[PDB]
Amino acid sequence: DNPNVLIDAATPLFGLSLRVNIEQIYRQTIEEIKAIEIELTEQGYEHAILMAYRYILCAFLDESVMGTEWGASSLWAEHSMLSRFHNETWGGEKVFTILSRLEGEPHRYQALLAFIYHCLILGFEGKYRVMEGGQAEREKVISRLHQLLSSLE
């Protein structure tokens, strides 16, 4: 399949994430995450891959909301996407743990790798946001991942 399939499936959530009735957007986001999962399952995508995808999507959206001024004090902070879908509260470390595993089998996981690259260049920081020297280290991650994607042709 095409390496952009998971990016394509996530485009409504990327737009949604970029502009962040708070209650409203919260609920539409929960519904859309599940709808995307169902759509990709129908297309025959592997459950384990879809759970890694969903995990990263949740962490991405949560970080987008926690970056705002109203985020940490809103209903979203109280019960985040990652908490509702994966029963975890941050995701900032585990996104990169997942990335490292996927990079152990990169041809197999090309589409999810491409998705993670897109998240990174859209500004996802995770653990790098609060790491000393984190901005430079994150740029090294992005450079390595671009090189990997390039080597997968």
Partner: peptide, 5 residues
């Protein structure tokens, strides 16, 4: 499971 530890 890719989302383990």
């Amino acid at each position: 499971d890719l989302t383990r530890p």
